[PDB]
Design a protein around this nucleic acid. Structure first.
Length: 123
DNA sequence: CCGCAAGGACCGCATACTACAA
């Protein structure tokens, strides 16, 4: 029941609530927000994969995405960048149209990068 | 009747050399 009360079934303590709120606070305080929101956004920078895809298939994908659900599209973009992966859509007929489209693009411009790097440095 | 009575080249090369979902 606690899980159902929270977004993404993810219960939060007071400190992590602050953590989730903090980006919108900085947004209102500075007008600024980090350009790459999730690790997937960073991952898809690999060989400009997302940029190449969006130019070639970006418009069509967002159209089919909203056809499945309006909650998948925000500001003419996918609500989550993991929707560039076919497996995300798999885990009904409108969904199959997306996966076939994604797989077609992969054979053309390559599979999307699924790995990213964490860099920590210290003197 | 007698004698001789193998030698080097090549020497595994290339391709494929994870894909994908659950």
């Amino acid at each position: 029941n606690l899980k159902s009360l929270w977004l993404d079934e993810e219960p939060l303590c007071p400190m992590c609530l602050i953590k989730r709120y903090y980006p919108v606070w900085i947004r209102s305080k500075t007008g600024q927000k980090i350009r790459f929101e999730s690790v997937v956004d960073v991952a898809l920078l690999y060989k400009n994969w997302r940029k190449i895809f969006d130019e070639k298939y970006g418009k069509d994908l967002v159209s089919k995405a909203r056809e499945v659900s309006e909650d998948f599209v925000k500001d003419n973009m996918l609500v989550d960048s993991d929707l560039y992966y076919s497996s995300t859509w798999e885990s009904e007929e409108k969904v199959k149209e997306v996966v076939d489209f994604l797989n077609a693009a992969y054979k053309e411009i390559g599979n999307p990068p699924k790995y990213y790097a964490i860099l920590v440095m210290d003197g």
